[PDB]
Design a protein around this ligand. Structure first.
Ligand SMILES: Nc1nc(O)c2[nH]nnc2n1
Ligand SMILES: Nc1nc(O)c2[nH]nnc2n1
Ligand SMILES: [Zn+2]
Ligand SMILES: [Zn+2]
Lengths: 187, 183
């Protein structure tokens, strides 16, 4: 009777508490905490958050819930964008009288999320890990169009990538190190 | 609807029914015909003119169905394909419809997928995509497919997703032209 993806407690918490982060690094810092927490709550090493671009108010956060949620569409970007839309009560994050919105993401978007970003109404995309980083640990980005960044820019969506990339990469390599069946107390 | 503790996209009555009534449609045109019934039911339930369904490829057991619920669900990701693929996964208790021991799954869709849905198809585990209306047909009533890679069809086929296109296209267009005429 519904499409229903449950949020683990830490994500409910993130989505409940008012929070304002002005600097790109502050915003991405927070998104990287959610990655760490999502991995500790049985999810993939990806998180994202929709902010008010100009005030830094957090609207909504998401994390990859593919396995726990039994749903291949539950990438961090889909959850973040959709929960932001559900909170603001509109399918269009650029609807009249909404502030401009920004998707802050732990990694460059896959081809699915790329499309979702375009349809979402956000005006800004801010990424940490690059596509090659993500692919290096076996997560596929899929076939995006050529010059997909230019693609976004031409729809009025500004793209920045590499923001706190080093910390992001460190979280990716930590996930990979502990993504295996032999028990490892250190994980 | 908005929820503290879930992303929750509710389904209108016809779609709750479609997802619970037993239905075996062996021939592909029987599959696409039923999907076009869902398109019409969706328009009457304030949705866009798009529907899709996951079938077991060989038997044509219907596993799940989705329709575009963008405006009434306040969700730009709620295309037909996303809901159909996600409800099937929910129904089969797995995020991968090609998981060992599941029969091969097929997504039958009213129109060729947009770039988002193209991506969702690849990650879903379906082994087959069957489309009615073409990309052109969708753009001609003002729906945007977005920037898909050159040769999106070959991209699907290259990872073992067979693509059929044009099936009951004229029937699907009749519904599209009606939707566009009635704004
Ligand atoms: N490539 C990729 N893979 C996943 O599993 C994701 N989850 N959130 N962003 C994602 N990106
Ligand atoms: N382009 C496009 N747009 C929508 O709103 C859809 N819903 N289901 N397939 C869809 N395809
Ligand atoms: Zn993605
Ligand atoms: Zn789509």
């Amino acid at each position: 009777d519904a499409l229903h993806i449950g949020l683990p407690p830490f994500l409910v918490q993130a989505n409940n508490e008012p929070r304002v982060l002005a600097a790109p690094e502050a915003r991405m810092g927070y998104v990287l905490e959610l990655v760490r927490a999502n991995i500790a709550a049985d999810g993939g090493p990806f998180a994202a958050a929709v902010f008010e671009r100009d005030s830094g108010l957090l609207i909504a956060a998401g994390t990859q819930r593919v396995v726990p949620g039994r749903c291949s569409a539950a990438h961090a970007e889909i959850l973040a964008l959709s929960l932001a839309q559900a909170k603001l009560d509109t399918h269009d994050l650029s609807a009249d009288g909404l502030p401009a919105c920004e998707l802050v993401t732990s990694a460059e978007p896959c081809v699915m999320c790329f499309g979702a970003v375009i349809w979402s109404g956000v005006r800004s995309l801010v990424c940490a890990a690059r596509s090659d980083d993500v692919e290096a640990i076996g997560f596929d980005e899929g076939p995006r169009p050529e010059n997909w960044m230019g693609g976004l820019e031409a729809r009025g969506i500004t793209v920045t990538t590499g923001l706190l990339r080093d910390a992001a990469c460190a979280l990716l390599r930590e996930y990979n190190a502990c993504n295996g069946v032999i028990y490892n107390a250190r994980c």
